[PDB]
Symmetry: C2
Subunit: 102 residues, 2 copies
């Protein structure tokens, strides 16, 4: 499980990274590209559940194909998702902490 949560969180973060970029006034195409590469990078890696990761790849391929204050919204979204992400990782730590404690 613990492997499948890490690779899951990475992809979700990289997806969020890409939304932050898309939600900006002037989308940094190079960055988006770099981020799209990291995603398929981290994914392909994890791809070696194997169906769900295959399903992710299939779904990512489709997002890619459809990919096109406004900068204020982008930054607030980024702010919010990092905190939610960190909230989960905090709680998740408190558990691996507990598992060990036993």
């Amino acid at each position: 499980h613990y492997a499948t949560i890490e690779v899951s969180q990475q992809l979700r973060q990289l997806l969020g990274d890409q939304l932050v970029i898309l939600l900006r006034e002037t989308p940094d195409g190079q960055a988006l590209e770099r981020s799209q590469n990291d995603f398929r990078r981290v994914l392909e890696q994890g791809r070696a559940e194997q169906a769900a990761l295959d399903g992710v790849r299939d779904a990512y391929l489709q997002l890619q194909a459809h990919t096109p204050d406004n900068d204020g919204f982008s930054e607030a979204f980024n702010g919010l998702r990092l905190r939610l992400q960190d909230l989960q990782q905090l709680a998740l730590a408190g558990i691996s902490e507990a598992e060990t404690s036993a």
Copy 2:
């Protein structure tokens, strides 16, 4: 066990909040956002969040949720500013990543 169960409830809250944040993205990423469904989602987010802050036991997790509240308010404050293919592909992608992750967590659990 019980220490472990408070942590898992905080994970559940964060998952629902991310799902609801996702719901809003899907709406705003459409040719024409539906302001009515948007505000229903915004009202859902703040209900689940406020109940999270009300019932969360672990004190660091409580403080974390206060930060989530501050950032959510900022998110709303910047929304009034603001195909359909991207929005639909996004939706499918995030749902599979979420379900995938929530399986393993329930797995460990």
